[PDB]
Amino acid sequence: ANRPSWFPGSKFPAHLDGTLPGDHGFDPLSLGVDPAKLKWYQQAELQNGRWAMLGAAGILVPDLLRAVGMGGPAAQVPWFEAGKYEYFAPPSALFASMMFLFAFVEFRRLQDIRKPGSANQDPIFTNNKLPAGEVGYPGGIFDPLGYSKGNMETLKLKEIKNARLAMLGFAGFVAQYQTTGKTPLQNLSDHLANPWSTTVLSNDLAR
């Protein structure tokens, strides 16, 4: 009579009561038993997920355009080769610049995990400021289309589920490339050709 269970017929972990979004009662290693840690671990699921949703849409997309041919020579570069691909500055300069950029956003966001509701205010412009929001859900300018009113709860249970799937997706891409040494779409096509013999077992047995 409660939330969906990761395995129907199993009890819900005591610490996992259902308060957390997507709390399908899944903590076999009891990693988030500590409530204080459950709070950090929760934010880490959101950030790790949101970043992986962009990472999965940042690999499948370029390959999709490359497959259709719509993508330029840049898309023709496989994601696991984009690093060598030239652009305008050497790989080092790009990383250093993104680091300085990240330091500001990351530290500004942390101020909110540490003191909830203490970073929502434009430093340069006192007038500009984000409205009150749950740690992890910035809102305000971070929600320009104003979808923070239309069913936030089920739009939040839509994010965690997509995020978890996207996180397993980025794991599959790396693992498949680690073994097959090919782009994800290539592996998918290899399967849809002979699906009853291109299973991981058959591939690893052949290895």
Residues in contact with ligand CHL by CB under 6 A are 80-84, 91, 94-95, 98
Phi, psi of 154 (to 5 degrees): -80, -20
Please tell me whether residue 71 binds ligand LUT under the rule CB under 6 A. no
Q: Contact region for ligand CLA (CB under 6 A) — 145-153, 161-169, 173-181, 197-205? A: 161-169
Buried b (16+ CB within 10 A) or exposed e, 84-97: eeeeeeeeeeeeee
Q: What is the CB-side half-sphere exposure of residue 183 using CA atoms within 13 A?
A: 21
Nearest-approach distance from CB 68 to ligand CLA, in angstroms = 29
Interface residue with ligand CLA, options 35, 44, 62, 102 (CB under 6 A): 44
Please tell me whether residue 171 binds ligand LUT under the rule CB under 6 A. yes
What crossing angle do the helices spanning 152-179 and 184-193 adopt, rounded to 10°? 80
Cβ atoms of 32 and 156 within 8 Å: the answer is: no
Q: Where are the beta strands (DSSP E) in 38-195?
A: none
- Near ligand LUT in 18-37, by CB under 6 A: 26-29, 31
H helix or E strand, kind and range, residue 199: none
- Is 59 or 119 the residue whose CB approaches ligand CHL more closely? 59
- Is 84 or 207 the residue whose CB approaches ligand CHL more closely? 84
Q: Which residue type is seen at 55?
A: G
Buried b (16+ CB within 10 A) or exposed e, 125-156: eeeeebeebebbebbeeebeeeeeeeebeeeb
Please tell me whether residue 52 binds ligand LUT under the rule CB under 6 A. yes
Nearest-approach distance from CB 101 to ligand CHL, in angstroms = 11
> Is the CA virtual torsion 156, 161, 165, 167 positive or negative?
positive
Please tell me whether residue 45 binds ligand CLA under the rule CB under 6 A. yes
Residues that bind ligand LUT (CB under 6 A): 26-29, 31, 48, 51-52, 55, 58-59, 79, 82, 167-168, 170-171
Residues that bind ligand CLA (CB under 6 A): 6, 16, 20, 22-27, 31-32, 38, 41-42, 44-45, 48, 164, 167-168, 171
